[PDB]
């Protein structure tokens, strides 16, 4: 009884010639869900495209209308206004942009509406969860920030929401959206240093009445499954003890795996799925969205595993013959491994940051 949103069109969009972000990856996921016969254990839905009045509760109407009117072949009149909204270089303009944004935001708002009305406990929208887009400009491959809309929907019934983020990059759009409120708490586990977006410092914990209600866990290179677990379980446990969330939005970016295009971590499929296990084990209403992920064979396999494990099933190790099978050679297994990349987190460092966090959380 897991709501699983999926629109068939989202896999036909195309960012640009050699761009790293391919929505096609989502389609690959579905193509393994069907051939793994998980189609029958899931309540599969088709998202209602979000209107324009739905998308301008976070964003501004000027930015959303610009997104509406623009077009890749009639942007000789928009070319001046392009970079006023950060559009153009790594957030390009492509054919059918507004459709893609409406698809993803509609999936997220639909999941929130499923959870509001008791129709399920766990919802899945693998083609949403774009956490970088800001209120008045695109930012780092994301144009509209659907997660803020999902949370604004959840807050109608529930009273306190928790947004957990395990994308290697920082979730800056979401954190900046709810930075001065206590009703939503953001928690991010991100590589820090000389890295995108360069925010996310361990002393940035909200303002106003939001003081203490954010959590930034600045890690370093090469981190692996055991260290990640050792710093993930204590903080999550104390947040659930002291914050007492009612709804959980879990962001499942997969550029934190070993071998990614733009990643510097060393997790593996087991190390990544441990987080989903541990957050599920609290028996809460849980939306579970996608995120980063730029080596698409890894993304497909890991997201398939996490869906089969969120439902409650036990998928085989081998891979069922499907259309995108040859992407997964030469082994053809549902496993993503890790490499001998050298860790850079000394145990003393992890314990220091963990203690500083937990001492912050006691208020």
């Amino acid at each position: 009884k897991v709501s699983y949103f999926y629109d068939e069109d989202v896999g036909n969009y195309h960012y640009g010639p050699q761009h790293p972000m391919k929505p096609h990856r989502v389609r690959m996921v579905h193509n393994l869900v069907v051939n793994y016969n998980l189609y029958e254990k899931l309540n599969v839905i088709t998202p209602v495209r979000a209107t324009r009045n739905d998308m301008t509760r976070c964003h501004t109407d000027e930015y959303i209308e610009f997104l509406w009117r623009v077009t890749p072949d009639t942007m000789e009149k928009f070319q001046p206004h392009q970079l006023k909204f950060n559009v153009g270089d790594d957030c390009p303009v492509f054919d059918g942009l507004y459709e893609f944004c409406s698809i993803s935001a509609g999936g997220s708002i639909g999941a929130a509406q499923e959870l509001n009305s008791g129709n399920a406990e766990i919802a899945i929208n693998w083609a949403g969860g774009l956490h970088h887009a800001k209120k008045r400009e695109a930012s780092g491959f994301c144009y509209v920030n659907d997660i803020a809309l999902a949370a604004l929907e959840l807050l109608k019934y529930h009273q306190r929401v928790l947004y957990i983020d395990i994308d290697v990059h920082h979730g800056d759009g979401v954190e900046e959206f709810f930075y001065t409120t206590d009703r939503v708490m953001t928690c991010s586990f991100h590589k820090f240093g000389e890295y995108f977006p360069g925010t996310g410092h361990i002393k940035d914990t909200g303002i106003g009445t939001g003081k203490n209600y954010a959590v930034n866990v600045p890690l370093r290179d090469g981190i692996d499954d055991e260290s990640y677990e050792s710093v993930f379980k204590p903080v999550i446990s104390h947040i659930m003890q002291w914050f007492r969330p009612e709804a959980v939005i879990l962001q499942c970016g997969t550029d934190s795996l070993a071998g990614d295009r733009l990643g510097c971590f060393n997790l593996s499929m087991k190390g990544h799925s441990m987080c989903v296990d541990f957050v599920k084990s609290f028996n809460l209403p849980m939306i579970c969205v996608g995120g980063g992920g730029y080596t698409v064979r890894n993304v497909a396999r890991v997201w398939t595993y996490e869906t089969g494990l969120l439902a409650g099933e036990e998928l085989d190790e081998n891979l069922p013959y499907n259309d995108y099978l040859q992407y997964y050679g030469p082994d053809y297994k549902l496993n993503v491994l890790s490499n001998n990349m050298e860790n850079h987190n000394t145990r003393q460092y992890l314990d220091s940051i963990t203690s500083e966090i937990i001492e912050n959380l006691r208020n």
Binding site: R57, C58, T60, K84, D172, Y179
Partner: protein
Amino acid sequence: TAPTSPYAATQEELLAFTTIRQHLPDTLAFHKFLELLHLYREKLLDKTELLNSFSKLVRNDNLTLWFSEFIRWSDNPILVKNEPVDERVYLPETFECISLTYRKLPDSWKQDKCSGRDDLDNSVLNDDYISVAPKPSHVKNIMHHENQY
């Protein structure tokens, strides 16, 4: 068979250039011609000056015209305009800081409206603080991506 490199010399142009050297009565004139070409390559020899010296070495009008056609010469008033970039692409870093990265907003930027906001979202969402990431200046030890497999 043999592969054609990108922008490889075509046969017509090689023929024409060897006839140019042949009209040049000397191997010293041919060497001077190579010197002209090289000095144009090394950003010490202009375009029109290359054409002028080429003509004063070839003393033939049709070859001057063929060169000016190969050089892709065009005399037009080069127009240079300087347009500043929009205020919003750099203005953030003049805002009164609050923390390392969060900077208070000025009143002129809290003057645009989102039209789908009800009474809830006007009390949950953050309105007046931005997140201005920090800017490197002169990085001087750049890391690469080394795994080539």
